[PDB]
Design a protein around this ligand. Structure first.
Ligand code: A1AA3
Lengths: 358, 358
């Protein structure tokens, strides 16, 4: 018998890697009609493979909620399960790209059966040894597994763009001599747009997590509904690097710039509206879901509501500005990107002043 | 005040992603003298940046051992620190690639100073509010931080090859029609060498984690020496995806097959020998570093040593057979790969049989 905490922590460390695998082809597309069609299908494949893996992760979370502890043999079998799930993103992509060929669906079916067989072995082993079962066995989701998966997914998504910078955007000496007259600074400057995208992408996904971090500190017990929205929250957060990378790219006409800013704001709203939904959904059954410091009329109630609702409000103002002003919108988008971090920093005083004003 | 357990775990998720960033160029190198020189420098940079980032991570662990708890302001500041450290891999690569130009060294000095001031702010903020410091203040490394970083590193390292397969090696419908006569099976079969690389890489990297996980469950209190040896163990584990990719590559002459097996066996020995070194180092101060269940003469003592010493001992035989046999060497390596997982599965039975014989 062994404590299962770490074995699972590693388990979600792999899944977050696998779930977000298909985002990499999305962000690596190079910038028209054919590109748009290609970009759409890549995005569609990403969302599908994210949910499929998430269901497999969900089954694992439930499966190991029964097996309270772990031993040497189960750890080996657990690895075989994870080794089995790592094929879903590839197998699915083959299936969609090849709907006519029956081989594609067969591989997809084989993989799903393989995951089931390994899990069937895992549960069988546990029953054969009652001391490996949870005391209850000897709806709610485990909170740690939701936390650990979320932390991973954000870390990959936050740092996607830099990994591309560290690899493909390191100047090569020969080009420096030829196309930059031997000036290193010029070579770095030509890469400046790509560096701004990373700064914005990290700041957004860096703060979106901060709202998530403070939300789940006061959550007593997650629920299936909260987990499902959380999955939808993270699914869209994966598109943020794509959004920012598009915004910083050169625009031939002002209409091109406006359209991209509309696209970028849409994903930020979708990513953070569901975090607000989780708060509201918890409020419905707050008696059994949240700490008593965030109940209706509680001390932190007003603070938490604002903290989650800032991005939904900020994004709508940016989107509304695009529709109405049509000329200062780009400045507002950049201005808000610099203002939102300040609002998060001064949230305590800002809300207190507002309460006095009201 | 807030519990920092989740906040730190996120920082270790970011750092593990950052430390092993430079391994991606290493494994993307395509297969002669120039390539050897190009491959050597890439491996040299990867080893350096891993040590630099781990040095940054080591400071982070010590810093936040003084900041016991956290609140809203600290969480934002911690994010600032991560934003700064995510540039060390890129800035260092710029410095090395351009030793002559003084700009590169200036950026590296700037980035390092940036981390210093941000940490200076955090320590200053905590001292301003005594209640946010640890009770002791208001050498040993925190165990959880060592595990979280280690689990991340194995997760990225284990799945490195698959993320490349899901992205680069999905058959092209037009190519299948042209270069494979429209037979999907032919296209997938041409990909077979790449898949066998992933099978071994996951198992070898996967089973190394299982040995690592078993060790760190029985350790009371990590130590600086253990942390340093752990860092070296992870640094070489990053080379396993490279090793198995080379072995599976087509060989023009048998001597090439022999050379690749020597390198592949070497990396496994270096990766696993240091995990044995951690065990040996801990035993020196067993009274204050390990469970009594793994002391000299303990119930599990013999079992643990076999589990860690399996790969170091198994690897030498694969290398030894290379020099002596020279014709069954390649066969032995393949058989050994299918043999070690069985030995790990049946370790408890195998050790019992050996004890009875002795
Ligand atoms: N977060 C990760 C994990 C693993 N790999 C990457 C990555 C980064 C940059 C480029 C490529 C790439 C590799 C190719 N062989 C072909 C085309 N792009 C992969 C990112």
């Amino acid at each position: 018998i062994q404590c299962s905490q770490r074995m699972l922590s590693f388990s979600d460390a792999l899944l977050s890697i696998i779930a977000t695998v298909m985002i990499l082809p999305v962000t690596h597309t190079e910038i028209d009609r054919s590109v748009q069609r290609l970009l759409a299908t890549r995005i569609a494949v990403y969302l599908m493979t994210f949910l499929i893996v998430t269901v497999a992760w969900a089954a694992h979370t439930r499966l190991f909620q029964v097996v309270g502890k772990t031993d040497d043999t189960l750890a080996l079998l657990n690895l075989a399960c994870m080794m089995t799930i790592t094929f879903l993103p590839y197998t699915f992509s083959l299936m969609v790209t090849f709907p006519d060929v029956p081989l594609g669906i067969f591989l997809f079916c084989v993989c799903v059966i393989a995951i089931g067989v390994v899990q069937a072995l895992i549960v069988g082993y546990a029953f054969h040894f009652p001391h490996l079962l949870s005391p209850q066995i000897q709806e709610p989701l485990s909170k740690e597994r939701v936390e650990a998966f979320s932390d991973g997914v954000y870390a990959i998504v936050a740092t996607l763009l830099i990994l591309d910078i560290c690899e493909d955007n390191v100047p090569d000496p020969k080009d420096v001599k030829e196309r930059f007259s031997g000036s290193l600074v010029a070579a770095l400057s030509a890469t400046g747009p790509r560096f701004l995208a990373y700064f914005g992408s990290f700041a957004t996904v860096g703060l979106l997590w901060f709202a998530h971090h403070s939300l789940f500190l006061h959550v007593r017990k997650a629920t299936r509904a909260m987990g499902l929205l959380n999955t939808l929250s993270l699914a869209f957060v994966g598109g943020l690097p794509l959004a920012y990378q598009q915004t910083s790219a050169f625009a031939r006409q002002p209409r091109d710039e406006l359209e991209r800013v509309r696209v970028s704001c849409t994903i930020i709203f979708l990513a953070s509206i569901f975090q607000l939904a989780m708060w509201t959904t918890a409020l419905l059954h707050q008696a059994e879901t949240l700490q008593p410091s965030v109940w209706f009329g509680g001390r932190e109630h007003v603070l938490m509501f604002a903290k989650l609702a800032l991005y939904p409000c900020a994004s709508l103002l940016a989107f509304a500005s695009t529709c109405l002003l049509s000329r200062f919108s780009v400045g507002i988008f950049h201005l808000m990107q610099i203002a939102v971090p300040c609002a998060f920093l001064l949230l305590r005083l800002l809300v207190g002043l507002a309460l006095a004003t009201l």
